[PDB]
């Protein structure tokens, strides 16, 4: 005779999504801190990065993910691009090129808990 | 007696969408790079592109998926077409024509992990 | 005693909508494609076509569906019709008239997978 | 012992909501077609009709399903109405009076599948 | 050996929001219906009234549900008040003073199905 | 051999928000009555509440619920203020100054029945 | 024969999103409460501050938690920073520089019960 | 994609136990002592393993 | 990256029985009087004890 039930320990599942406009400009090099973790769940989703500045102008923008560089990932002006990913901890811009550039960061954060 | 129980390894479901407005113009045939695939899940979803440039003037747009143009698949400005799809990996945009269009493409992921 | 458990292979259930406005002017009977399917999935949802074009003077639109017109369905301008249908592969719309009418369509597209 | 597991055939419940306007006048007591099923499913859901018209001038709308004139749903200009049905097929709105009033229909189409 | 499996019969939950806005005058103590119900179900939901008349002039809105008013459930000019409630059938709203005020009714409905 | 099943009584999970904004004086200390509950469940949920009236000059709002004041909630005007909690009866504002301002109240309603 | 199951429990997931804008001084080292947790719940979230001020102009905002702040989480006018964590029971804002700046909180609160 | 399993009973590999993915395979014996699985591939797969023992004492 | 299991059974503990995570273990035995979980690492982990009785009386 079975005792107790091993049954499931179940589990919510968050899908979240931020949006934000920044004043991008050259920043040397230096990427600019705009999402960190500091949970022990592991995260996915999609991030997507639009430049709406002057065409020609505006600085280019490229995404930083766990340190490192997205390959080929820079947006010029009039643009978006988004990109999938899983196991994401840190997400970054580095901005570069003369002016400024009204730069829009969205994200979604997908996890279970 | 049984020991322990198969249960199950449910999973979540995601289904986010994206959105971005980008000045598009005669690129030469070169497909700009919008969405890639950097994970190893099965990914659906429908896929719009509307073309608000002035009529007759701006530049037509085609859409491309896994390296392949779609069949057919040009819009003209003034109008809109959406296309689902299975295993979606990457998407990018082809324009042709004399002049620059405000081109909305928009796009939902579907997957489950 | 059983072994291993037939349990189930668990479906997320896909609902997404889709709005676009086209200029539709006259076509000579030729349906212009809005939507079209390359799955192997079943489709249900739901159709709504809303002319928003001047009083009796823009062209009136037409719904066609797997090819075929949808008996009775044409919508005359300041009017919106909308219908449910199951097993959708291709939507698409025919403007017969005169002059250009702002046509706005949307549809609901629902499948498991 | 057990072969086999009777299990279930779990459905998605699809909820989905809609929403026009309309310029409506006299139509002599014929129905303008606004929703039709054509599907096997049934059908549950609530309908909303608001009369945004001039106070006092504009012509009263009054709801139809199946065939069937609702007892007593007429509505006034500056007045909305909803009513709560199930087994629903059709939807279709009677405009008696003088003049043009901006009326807003919506409704819910609730459904498994 | 068990034949056959007693399982269930999974409802779909409906969770539907509604919001309409009246100009609200001296109606003499009749109730103006807003919701009716139809159906066999039972409904919950919250009930929301908002009076953005001119402070101190426009006329006062009181609640009728099931046929008797909610006792004190009046909203003078720029207030707003929400009441949740089990085994909703019928939403009125009496109007009582002089002038006329832009009343916002909201209400939520949920059940099984 | 078992005859029947225990199962489940499965609950629909019931999440809605609610949103308004009122004229706010001085009311000597009289709570005006903002939401009320009228059902058996238990109810939890976040209140917020933002006051936007001219800085240093509008009167501040202080929370009350279940008829006891919140300890410290007390909002000066360009700021927010928001206060998750279980088993939430009733809600109250609370005005205290000089002049009028345009005080915010959301909040959100959380139970399963 | 099994008497009984043991079953579960199922626990309702809440999952809202909070919102607001205030205007931030310089408050001397002061936190200014934003949000605090008196329920027994465990409560995670993402936590998101954006400061729209004028660029090197507006003061500079701190996030607090849990009564201690975040390393290095200081945001500059012209820009937006986000942090997921868990058990989170307070959220507070310090602010510090010369003038005002128009700074906006956001934070989501995801639980089960 | 998945990685491929294979069976081991007794320290000797069944003939042809292979298991590619989207797959089950059963096999009933006598005398057995010891079940370990072997994967082979690239990437990682959820793999069920069940067995039943019968004895008596 | 959660902490491994070691069983114990009779106050000794079981050669090699040591379970990483994504993995189970099964071990059939005679003679059982005791049964206990040693844990070893950082985090925590949702490991799973199931466990046959058999006998006559």
């Known amino acids: 005779a079975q005792i107790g ?3 499931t320990e179940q589990l919510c599942c968050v899908n979240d999504a ?3 406009t920044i ?6 090099g230096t990427a ?5 973790d500091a949970t022990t ?10 430049n709406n500045g002057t065409v020609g102008v505006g600085p ?8 490192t560089a997205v390959g080929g990932f820079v947006v010029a ?6 990109i999938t990913m899983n196991d994401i901890n840190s997400i970054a811009i580095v901005g570069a090129g003369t ?3 009204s730069v829009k960061i969205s994200f979604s954060i997908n996890y279970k808990f």
Chains 1, 2, 3, 4, 5, 6, 7 share one sequence.
């Open 18 to 20: 931020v949006c934000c």
């Open 5 to 7: 039930n091993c049954c």
């Open 77 to 82: 002006p009039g643009e978006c691009r988004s």
């Open 60 to 67: 280019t923008a490229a995404l930083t993910v766990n340190g």
């Open 99 to 101: 002016g400024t550039s």
């Open 41 to 50: 769940f592991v995260i996915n989703g999609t991030i997507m990065v639009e």
């Open 32 to 36: 600019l801190p705009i999402w960190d």
């Open 23 to 28: 004043i991008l400009d050259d920043t040397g």
